[PDB]
Copies of this chain bind each other. A is one copy, B any other.
Amino acid sequence: MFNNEPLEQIDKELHDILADEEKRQRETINLIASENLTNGAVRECLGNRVSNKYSEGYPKKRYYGGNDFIDKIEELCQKRALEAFNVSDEEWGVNVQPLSGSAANVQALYALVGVKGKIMGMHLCSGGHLTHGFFDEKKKVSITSDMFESKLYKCNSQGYVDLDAVREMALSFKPKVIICGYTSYPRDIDYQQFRQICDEVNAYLFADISHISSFVACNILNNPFLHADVVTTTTHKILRGPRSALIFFNKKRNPGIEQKINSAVFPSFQGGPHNNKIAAVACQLKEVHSPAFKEYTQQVLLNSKALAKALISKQIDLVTNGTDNHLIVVDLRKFSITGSKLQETCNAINVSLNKNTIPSDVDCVSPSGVRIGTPAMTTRGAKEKDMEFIADVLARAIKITVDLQEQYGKKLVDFKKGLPGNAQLQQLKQEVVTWAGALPFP
Q: List residues of A whose CB falls within 8 A of some B CB.
A: 1-7, 10-11, 13-14, 17-18, 20-22, 24-25, 28, 32, 34-41, 43-54, 63-66, 68-70, 72-73, 76, 99-103, 106, 110, 114-115, 129-131, 141-143, 146-147, 236, 240, 242-243, 267-272, 274, 276, 279, 282-283, 286-287, 292, 295-296, 299, 343-344, 346-347, 350, 352-355, 378-381, 440, 442
Assembled-state Cα–Cα distance A7/B283 (Å): 8
Q: Assess whether A143 is in contact with B269, with CB atoms less than 8 Å apart.
A: yes
Number of copies: 2
Assembled-state Cα–Cα distance A267/B105 (Å): 14
Q: Which residues of B contact A22 (CB under 8 A)?
A: 49
Q: Which residues of B contact A141 (CB under 8 A)?
A: 267-268
| A55, chain B: closest CB distance, angstroms | 10
Q: Which residues of B contact A236 (CB under 8 A)?
A: 51
A114's nearest neighbour on chain B, judged by CB, is B146
Q: Assess whether A270 is in contact with B100, with CB atoms less than 8 Å apart.
A: yes
Assembled-state Cα–Cα distance A215/B53 (Å): 22
Q: Which 5 A/B pairs are nearest by Cβ-Cβ distance?
A: A47-B47, A65-B347, A102-B271, A43-B47, A21-B69
Assembled-state Cα–Cα distance A52/B40 (Å): 12
Q: Which of B53, B72, B73, B102 meets A35, CB within 8 Å?
A: B53
Q: Assess whether A352 is in contact with B18, with CB atoms less than 8 Å apart.
A: no
Q: Assess whether A442 is in contact with B4, with CB atoms less than 8 Å apart.
A: yes
Q: Which of B20, B49, B69, B243 meets A43, CB within 8 Å?
A: B49
